[PDB]
Amino acid sequence: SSLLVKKLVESATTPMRGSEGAAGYDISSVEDVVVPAMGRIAVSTGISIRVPDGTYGRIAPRSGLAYKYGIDVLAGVIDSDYRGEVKVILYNTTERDYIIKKGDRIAQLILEQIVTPGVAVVLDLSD
Amino acid sequence: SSLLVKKLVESATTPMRGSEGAAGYDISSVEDVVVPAMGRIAVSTGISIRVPDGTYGRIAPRSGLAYKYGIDVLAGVIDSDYRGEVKVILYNTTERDYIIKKGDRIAQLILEQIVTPGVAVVLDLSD
Amino acid sequence: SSLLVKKLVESATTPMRGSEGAAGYDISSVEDVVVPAMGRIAVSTGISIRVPDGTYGRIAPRSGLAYKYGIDVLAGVIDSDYRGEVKVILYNTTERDYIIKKGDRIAQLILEQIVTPGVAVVLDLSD
Ligand SMILES: O=c1ccn([C@H]2C[C@H](O)[C@@H](COP(=O)(O)OP(=O)(O)O)O2)c(=O)[nH]1
Ligand SMILES: O=c1ccn([C@H]2C[C@H](O)[C@@H](COP(=O)(O)OP(=O)(O)O)O2)c(=O)[nH]1
Ligand SMILES: O=c1ccn([C@H]2C[C@H](O)[C@@H](COP(=O)(O)OP(=O)(O)O)O2)c(=O)[nH]1
Ligand SMILES: [Mg+2]
C-alpha cells in the first residue's frame, strides 16, 4: 500500500512529492555526472524501491530539464518485484552537454495503476 | 470526476476523444509553428486543465506524427493541481523540419490513474 | 477483463509476463530488421490485441535495449477499440545500427488504467 524505499548510500534522498496534487515523487541524483551532447547515461539514485502491488513505478521526465535542456527519459519501467537500484537513463537530445550535481532532481516516480489479467487467444477481437 | 477545461484563446479547442474506446482526448495546436529538424519546441494549446483527482494527465504521442515524421513527445506529465497552460514539447528526430498549423492534433491527453500513498523507509524490500 | 490476443502469423508469440510482479507482457518481433543509426522503424509483432475496457495498452521501452543500444520507443498508445496489428516504432538514438531477429523481445505491453469522463468547460479550475 505505502511506497517502500531502501536507502543505499549516504546522500540518498527519500522520494517525496513536490505538492498535494503532484503526480509523482522526486527522484534525484546521488552522483555528479554529465549527460553528453547527443548522448545518454544511467544516473545513480542511491535507492531501491517497491511500488505498491497493482501498479508499477514509471520514471517520468521532469518538465524543466526537458524544455530547457532537451533531456529525454529512456526506459523508465520499474516492475513491482524488482529489488535493484533505480537507474535513470537520460538522453541528451542537444548538441550541448548537460551537467548533473548530487542532489539534483533528475526525474519523477509516478505510481501508475495497471492490470495483469491472464491472456486468452481468439480469432476475432471484435463483437 | 469530469475533466475540467479552461479556454485561454479564441481558437482553443475543447479536448475530445476520437472514439468510444479511445485512450485519450485530442490536444491540438493554437499556433502555426515549425518543429525544426533535430530540434524541439513547446506548442501552444490555448487551454488549461484539471485532471480528475486520483490521476494525472499524460501528454502522449500521436501515432501518425510519430511513424511518418519522427515526432517525439518530451516531458508530458501534467499534475492535477497545475493551473497553467498546457504546453506540448515536441522533439523532431528527423533531418527534415516539420510544420504545424493552428488546429492540428499535436498529441493526446490520457487520464492515467495513479496512487500517492505515503513513503516508508525500510532496510529490506523483500519478504 | 482478460487480455485478448489474435495471432496473425506463424511465428507470432502469445504475449506473456516475465515474472509475477512484472509490469508488462513481452512484445516480440516476427521479422528480421534493422533499426538504422539515428533512424526509426515500425516492427511487426504478428499480433492484434484488445486491452481490457477501462485501460489502454502502452508499448513501453525495454530497459536492456535502452541502456545498451539507446533504443527509444515512439508512439506507443494502443486504444482499446483498435483492431489492427500492433506495430512498435523504434528510434535508434545511436550512431550505430541495431539488429532485430525474429523472436527478440522488442518491448513490453503495459495495461494502464485510465478514465474517460466527460469534459466540462469552466472559466476557473481553482477552488
Ligand atoms: O510537457 C509538459 C509537461 C508539463 N507541463 C506542465 C505540467 C506541470 O504541472 C508543470 C510543471 O512545471 P514544473 O514541474 O513546476 O517546472 P519543473 O518541471 O522544472 O519542476 O508544467 C506542461 O505544460 N507540458
Ligand atoms: O506505436 C504504436 C502506436 C499506435 N498503434 C496503433 C494503436 C492505435 O489504435 C492506432 C492509431 O492509429 P491512428 O491514431 O488512427 O492514426 P493517427 O495516430 O495518425 O490518428 O495505431 C500501433 O500499432 N503502434
Ligand atoms: O530506466 C530504468 C528502467 C528499468 N530499471 C529497472 C526496473 C526493472 O525491474 C529492471 C529490469 O531490468 P531487466 O528488464 O531484467 O533487463 P531487461 O530490460 O534487458 O529485460 O531494471 C531501472 O532501474 N531504470
Ligand atoms: Mg520518450
Residue numbers in the entry:
A (entry chain A), B (entry chain A), C (entry chain A): 2 to 128
Quote the study's own text.
dUTPase (EC 3.6.1.23) is a ubiquitous enzyme that catalyzes the hydrolysis of dUTP to diphosphate and dUMP, the substrate for thymidylate synthetase in dTTP biosynthesis.
Glycyl-seryl-tagged dUTPases yielded cubic P213 IL-3A crystals with unit-cell parameter a = 105.68 Å and hexagonal P63 Mu-22 crystals with unit-cell parameters a = 132.07, c = 53.45 Å, γ = 120°. Owing to the Thr84Arg mutation, Mu-22 dUTPase had different monomer-to-monomer interactions to those of IL-3A dUTPase.
